[PDB]
Amino acid sequence: GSSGSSGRRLPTVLLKLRMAQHLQAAVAFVEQGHVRVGPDVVTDPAFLVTRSMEDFVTWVDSSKISGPSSG
């Protein structure tokens, strides 16, 4: 309960955001450079992300990914 930085593995954040199927799926995707965080692309799953960055999570290439909505 101190002031600092609370980051979590990308794999965990992805699973929670229903971005991936299983832990192995999220981890594999990160290794294949499928998921990126903000202006910085992460390749390792051990990568820690902060609540602030959590919202700045996007897929390297979401061309196929559907979603007619914008915002």
mmCIF file of C-alpha atoms in Angstrom:
data_model
loop_
_atom_site.group_PDB
_atom_site.id
_atom_site.type_symbol
_atom_site.label_atom_id
_atom_site.label_comp_id
_atom_site.label_asym_id
_atom_site.label_seq_id
_atom_site.Cartn_x
_atom_site.Cartn_y
_atom_site.Cartn_z
ATOM 1 C CA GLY A 1 0.000 0.000 0.000
ATOM 2 C CA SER A 2 2.662 2.500 -1.039
ATOM 3 C CA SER A 3 3.102 5.063 -3.816
ATOM 4 C CA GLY A 4 4.828 3.615 -6.865
ATOM 5 C CA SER A 5 3.945 1.668 -10.003
ATOM 6 C CA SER A 6 1.632 -1.343 -10.236
ATOM 7 C CA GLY A 7 2.268 -3.091 -13.540
ATOM 8 C CA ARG A 8 1.125 -6.487 -14.796
ATOM 9 C CA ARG A 9 2.116 -8.952 -17.518
ATOM 10 C CA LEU A 10 0.661 -8.205 -20.954
ATOM 11 C CA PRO A 11 -0.643 -11.799 -21.133
ATOM 12 C CA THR A 12 -2.774 -11.265 -18.028
ATOM 13 C CA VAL A 13 -4.109 -7.900 -19.196
ATOM 14 C CA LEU A 14 -5.041 -9.441 -22.545
ATOM 15 C CA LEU A 15 -6.938 -12.348 -20.986
ATOM 16 C CA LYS A 16 -8.872 -9.952 -18.753
ATOM 17 C CA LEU A 17 -9.722 -7.697 -21.697
ATOM 18 C CA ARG A 18 -11.032 -10.780 -23.496
ATOM 19 C CA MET A 19 -8.294 -10.054 -26.036
ATOM 20 C CA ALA A 20 -6.962 -13.615 -25.947
ATOM 21 C CA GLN A 21 -8.360 -17.104 -25.364
ATOM 22 C CA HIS A 22 -6.004 -18.738 -22.863
ATOM 23 C CA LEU A 23 -2.759 -17.854 -21.084
ATOM 24 C CA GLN A 24 -0.787 -19.798 -23.690
ATOM 25 C CA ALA A 25 -2.634 -17.946 -26.452
ATOM 26 C CA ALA A 26 -1.899 -14.505 -25.009
ATOM 27 C CA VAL A 27 1.746 -15.378 -24.365
ATOM 28 C CA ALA A 28 2.250 -16.810 -27.851
ATOM 29 C CA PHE A 29 0.671 -13.745 -29.459
ATOM 30 C CA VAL A 30 3.032 -11.442 -27.565
ATOM 31 C CA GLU A 31 6.025 -13.491 -28.709
ATOM 32 C CA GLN A 32 4.830 -13.312 -32.315
ATOM 33 C CA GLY A 33 4.568 -9.543 -31.993
ATOM 34 C CA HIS A 34 0.795 -9.630 -32.402
ATOM 35 C CA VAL A 35 0.008 -7.289 -29.509
ATOM 36 C CA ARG A 36 1.529 -3.871 -28.830
ATOM 37 C CA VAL A 37 1.290 -1.252 -26.081
ATOM 38 C CA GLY A 38 0.957 2.387 -27.085
ATOM 39 C CA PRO A 39 3.754 3.890 -29.211
ATOM 40 C CA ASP A 40 5.899 0.974 -28.042
ATOM 41 C CA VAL A 41 5.597 -2.549 -29.442
ATOM 42 C CA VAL A 42 6.132 -5.352 -26.927
ATOM 43 C CA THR A 43 7.419 -8.775 -27.973
ATOM 44 C CA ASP A 44 7.822 -10.366 -24.544
ATOM 45 C CA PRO A 45 4.843 -11.398 -22.372
ATOM 46 C CA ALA A 46 6.729 -10.599 -19.166
ATOM 47 C CA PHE A 47 6.245 -6.979 -20.230
ATOM 48 C CA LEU A 48 4.593 -5.047 -17.399
ATOM 49 C CA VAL A 49 1.719 -2.678 -18.168
ATOM 50 C CA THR A 50 0.077 0.020 -16.051
ATOM 51 C CA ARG A 51 -3.651 0.739 -15.824
ATOM 52 C CA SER A 52 -2.890 3.825 -17.914
ATOM 53 C CA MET A 53 -1.202 1.759 -20.625
ATOM 54 C CA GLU A 54 -3.860 -0.949 -20.351
ATOM 55 C CA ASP A 55 -6.207 1.354 -22.263
ATOM 56 C CA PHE A 56 -3.433 2.005 -24.785
ATOM 57 C CA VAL A 57 -3.377 -1.661 -25.799
ATOM 58 C CA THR A 58 -3.851 -2.417 -29.496
ATOM 59 C CA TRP A 59 -3.097 -5.238 -31.933
ATOM 60 C CA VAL A 60 -0.105 -4.739 -34.227
ATOM 61 C CA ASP A 61 -2.297 -5.581 -37.218
ATOM 62 C CA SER A 62 -6.059 -5.451 -36.675
ATOM 63 C CA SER A 63 -6.855 -5.432 -40.394
ATOM 64 C CA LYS A 64 -8.971 -8.587 -40.222
ATOM 65 C CA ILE A 65 -10.390 -7.783 -36.785
ATOM 66 C CA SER A 66 -13.974 -6.569 -37.176
ATOM 67 C CA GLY A 67 -15.439 -3.425 -35.644
ATOM 68 C CA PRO A 68 -17.487 -0.890 -37.635
ATOM 69 C CA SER A 69 -17.565 1.303 -34.529
ATOM 70 C CA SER A 70 -15.029 4.080 -33.943
ATOM 71 C CA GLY A 71 -14.063 5.945 -30.788
#
